[PDB]
Every structure is written in structure tokens, then in C-alpha cells.
Amino acid sequence: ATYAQALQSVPETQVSQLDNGLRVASEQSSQPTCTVGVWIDAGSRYENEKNNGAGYFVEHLAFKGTKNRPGSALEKEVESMGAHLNAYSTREHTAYYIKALSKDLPKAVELLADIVQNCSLEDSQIEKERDVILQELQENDSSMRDVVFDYLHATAFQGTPLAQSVEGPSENVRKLSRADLTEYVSQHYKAPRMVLAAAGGVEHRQLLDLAQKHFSSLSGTYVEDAVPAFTPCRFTGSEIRHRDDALPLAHVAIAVEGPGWANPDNVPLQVANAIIGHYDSTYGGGTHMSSTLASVAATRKLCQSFQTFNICYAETGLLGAHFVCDNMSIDDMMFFLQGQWMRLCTSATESEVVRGKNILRNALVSHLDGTTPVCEDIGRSLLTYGRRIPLAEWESRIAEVDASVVREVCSKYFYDQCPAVAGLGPIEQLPDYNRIRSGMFWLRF
């Protein structure tokens, strides 16, 4: 049973669609557990400056109380059958998923229907929840990677809804009344923009009939006329530096415009990203890792941890790197990291491209291990691509990637493109934006 044989044997992703529009998608297997969740297309992108932070508030109040389950009773039902209920809200998607046994499927779907629909939104709990978010804002302020990435988004997509943080400024969260949230729920928690996903010991017919008998009350209209449209977001190459010398370590994230969820150029670029690799001070590979940047960093003890990212939204993305290093390394990595990118833009050997392809295949096949990652994959893919990409298709697209393709796509996205630097901490040594932009092009090429 070779790799290829296993790929065309992975269960399918049967997809259905009720009349209201809610797309039901399941993925049967043999495990006695399951993971059923609803992936809505809410997020900070669909939020104006007046109500930014509504999605976070709604996610907070989702599990608090319902009309049918008054409150803690919902938590009691979730805990009595051993299910773990979770929710994650991002800049584009917001989802609720219950991790429960296969036998508890009829009850779990009912619980998700109650949350996404008959949410109480009691004013007393709103007031209680108002402080919690404020505390969580300070906690996130302590999370230096998160604040650096929020700086990245703010300075890259400036003047666009994407620049808005998911949690929202700590002024909107102090005025968000019940009225603002109710419009968010009635305007974004709609059936067409919803995917009921499940994976594990789930039967697609069972999921379809449970959806028909529970989520039928979901509405597809948009009240009077208001249909929140998709606003394309401009990427304005800029920089932001919040220099705080008290911070022990300096975080710098630099990213250029990457593609959207469409534009198969993601597959080559990811391979290119895999060639750059990722490093942490506790790796153990040392001065032997195949990635040139990782080997240099380990040899000279340059950084504490650098990671390459390919954050991808519907029409644009932030493709680049983020590294954590001391005060007297920030410039040096700016030399090497950029020096790495241009190498892939001018001379990418087939050997390292094969290595990147293998790394990408491993990442994809490993990330889809376990019911919860599979459910997340289904819910995210149905919203981004409109269909779950089978692993065989991923394998084919990876196979079509070679050295010339990587060079072309990198030169198309990396070469001579203004970056979106964002730095925090003792970032004095961080090269000036003109120096970074100059480093974005090579005088040999």
C-alpha cells in the first residue's frame, strides 16, 4: 500500500445543502467519537469601526445562556456526556464545534442549533462579560507574538476592515450594548453563510436529517435589505515600530502580499516557505538543519525563534516571516532572511524544492490527523474554496511544483515588492524601511 494507494482511499467529504442554504458536510470513519461544529463566515473583516469587537462578544456569550437552556444547564448537558465544547473566532471565520462520542450525535447537533440561533444575550451577562474581555485584552497585550501580528495587520491593511483586530479596541468593547450584538447575530449568523461539519463516527444521512429537523428554522433573508457585501482590502506596504526597551526579546514580523484562498500559487509559495523552514532555540537540529536560515541562526545563536507564515484571506494574504531575537540580531536576520528569499527568487535548486514538497506533504497529511482537525478542515474549506480539497488533489498540485515554478512565483510575489514590517520591543537595530526595501531587490539579478 504505497502513498498514492492510501490517498485515493481516504473517505470522501459528502456535501449536502438544505433548502435554507445551510451546507451539511460529513466525513465518515470508524472512530467511536465525532466532532460536529458550525462554521460561520463572521469575523473582524465584516465589522465597521463602530461595532468592531461584536464577534468576540458574541462568541463569549454563546455558551453562557440560551432561550431553551437558561444558562449553566447547557454546560451541564455538555459535561454530562463528556463532550468538550469550544469556539474560535478569527478575522474571517467564527466556529463552534462539539467534541463528543458518536452516540451523542443527536444531542450535540441540537446543542449547536440552540447556540447558533436561540442565543439569549442577556444584558446582565453582557455586563459580566464586558469586564472579562477587558481583562483578556491586557492578557493579549502580554502576548507579544499576538500584538506583533495585530501590528502587522494594522500597518499592512491600513484603512480597511482587515486592519481591525478580532477582539476590538478597548473602547468599543466598553460600549457594545445588546442592540449592536443582535444586529451582528441577525446579519451574519445566516444559513447560507454557514457550514454544519462533522467528522468521525458520523453518518452523512444522520447529519442531514438532524440538520433538517433542527436548523430548518434558520433564515436566509437579510432583513429589510441590508446585505453586508465583501469589501476588497488594499495592502499598503508600510512599517510600524512600537519600541519598548524593557521587553527582554524583540519580535519582528515582515510580510509581503500573498495570494487569496483561490490562486493556486499558494501551493508553490508554501513549498518555498517550507524551504525557508522554521527554527526555535529548543530544536536540537543545531548547525545541521537543511534550512540555510535555521543553520545560520543555530550556528551564531542569532535568534530565539523564527517562523514563516502564509496567512491567507479571501482576496489577499500576508506571506512572510516572523522572528524573535535579541537586540543585536535584528538587522543580521534582516540580512539573512531577505537574503534567503531572493535566493529562491533567483536560484532555487531542484533538491531543495523536492525537500520542500516532502515537508509540505508531511504537514498536510499530519495536520489532518484526528477528528477535530478534520472537522476544522471541512468547515474552513467549504467557506474558503467552496469544496473540501481531497488529499489526492493536494498531491497532484504539489507534484506539479518544481524549481522553475517556485522561482517564478517567488519573483512574482517577493522580488521588488514593498514589505509590511512590524516590530516590537528593543527594535532599535531594526533596519530602516528604506534599507529593507533595498534588500527586497538584488543588484546581481
Partner 1 sequence: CTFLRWASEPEHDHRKRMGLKMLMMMGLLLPLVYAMKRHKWSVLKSRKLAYRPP
Q: Which residues bind partner 1 (CB under 8 A)?
A: 242, 432-434
Residue partners of 68: CB distance under 8 A and separation at least 6: 114, 118
What does the alpha-carbon distance between residue 331 and residue 24 come to, in Å, rounded to a whole number? 50
Least distance CB 424 / partner 1 (angstroms): 12
Identify which of residues 261 and 433 has a Cβ nearer to partner 1 in the complex: 433
Of 94, 140, 136, give the one whose Cα is nearest residue 115: 94
**Residue 291 · residue 321 · CB < 8 Å:** no
Indicate the helix (H) or strand (E) that contains 321. Answer: strand 317-325
Identify which of residues 169 and 264 has a Cβ nearer to partner 1 in the complex: 169
Q: Residue 309 corresponds to which cell in the numbers above? A: 507564515
Task: State whether residue 53 is helix, strand or coil.
Answer: coil
Of 58, 137, 64, 147, give the one whose Cα is nearest residue 95: 58
Q: Report the 10 Å Cβ neighbour count for 385.
A: 11
Least distance CB 331 / partner 1 (angstroms): 17
> Which stretches within 100-177 are classed as H helix?
105-115, 123-142, 144-156
Catalytic residue (choose from 12, 27, 47, 59): 59
What does the alpha-carbon distance between residue 367 and residue 356 come to, in Å, rounded to a whole number? 16
Active site residue 136: no
Q: Which residue has the cell 444584558?
A: 123
Of 200, 207, 173, give the one whose Cα is nearest residue 44: 173
What does the alpha-carbon distance between residue 68 and residue 354 come to, in Å, rounded to a whole number? 55
Burial of 97 (0-12, 13-18, 19+ CB in 10 A): buried
Identify which of residues 158 and 327 has a Cβ nearer to partner 1 in the complex: 158
Least distance CB 437 / partner 1 (angstroms): 9
Identify which of residues 135 and 434 has a Cβ nearer to partner 1 in the complex: 434
Least distance CB 430 / partner 1 (angstroms): 13
Identify which of residues 36 and 421 has a Cβ nearer to partner 1 in the complex: 421
Identify which of residues 242 and 397 has a Cβ nearer to partner 1 in the complex: 242
Indicate the helix (H) or strand (E) that contains 40. Answer: strand 33-40
**Residue 115 · residue 60 · CB < 8 Å:** no
What does the alpha-carbon distance between residue 414 and residue 92 come to, in Å, rounded to a whole number? 25
Least distance CB 55 / partner 1 (angstroms): 25
Identify which of residues 67 and 234 has a Cβ nearer to partner 1 in the complex: 234
Least distance CB 133 / partner 1 (angstroms): 20
Least distance CB 432 / partner 1 (angstroms): 7
Q: Report the 10 Å Cβ neighbour count for 281.
A: 12
What does the alpha-carbon distance between residue 286 and residue 307 come to, in Å, rounded to a whole number? 16
> What residues act catalytically?
59
